[PDB]
C-alpha cells in the first residue's frame, strides 16, 4: 500500500480563508454524514481489497479523511484546490470503476450533493489567517 497523501508540509505555507472554513464546516460536514460516505472516508486499501492495479491507474488518490485533515491543519492555500481534491476523489472512483457499479452511483450522488453545497459557497474570498513556511 502506498502512503496516504500528505496533510502538512513544512515547506508550504498554511492558509485559512472563509471559503475553506465553509468547506470544512458545511460541505465536508454534510458529505461526511451522507449514507454513501463510508467508501470514501478512508484511502483505498488496494492490498486489502484484492485490487493490485489500483495505483497504476489512480495516479492521484484522494479521500475524505485526507481532505478533512488537510482542512483541519490549514494545508490548502485557497478553496479551489480543496474543491479539486473532492473532484479528484469523485473522478478516481469514476475512472477506476464502471458506470453502472454501485460505488459509481454512490459517488455520483455524493458529487451532486457536493455541487449543491459548493453552489452555496461565499463568492468573495476573505483571508482569515496566513503563516509563512517554516
Amino acid at each position: 500500500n502506498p502512503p496516504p497523501p500528505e496533510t502538512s508540509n513544512p515547506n508550504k505555507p498554511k492558509r485559512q480563508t472563509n471559503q475553506l472554513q465553509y468547506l470544512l464546516r458545511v460541505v465536508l460536514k454534510t458529505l461526511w454524514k451522507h449514507q454513501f460516505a463510508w467508501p470514501f472516508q478512508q484511502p483505498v486499501d488496494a492490498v486489502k481489497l484484492n485490487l493490485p492495479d489500483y495505483y497504476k491507474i489512480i495516479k492521484t488518490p484522494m479521500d475524505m479523511g485526507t481532505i478533512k485533515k488537510r482542512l483541519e491543519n490549514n494545508y490548502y492555500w485557497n478553496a479551489q484546490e480543496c474543491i479539486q481534491d473532492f473532484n479528484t476523489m469523485f473522478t478516481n472512483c469514476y475512472i477506476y470503476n464502471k458506470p453502472g457499479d454501485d460505488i459509481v452511483l454512490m459517488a455520483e450522488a455524493l458529487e451532486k450533493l457536493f455541487l449543491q453545497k459548493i453552489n452555496e459557497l461565499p463568492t468573495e474570498e476573505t483571508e482569515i489567517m496566513i503563516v509563512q513556511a517554516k
Binding site: 481489497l49 470503476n97 457499479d101
Partner: peptide, 12 residues
Amino acid sequence: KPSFYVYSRVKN
C-alpha cells in the same frame, strides 16, 4: 470478517 466483504462488494 463479515463487515469487510461489504467493503469488497462495492469495489469489484
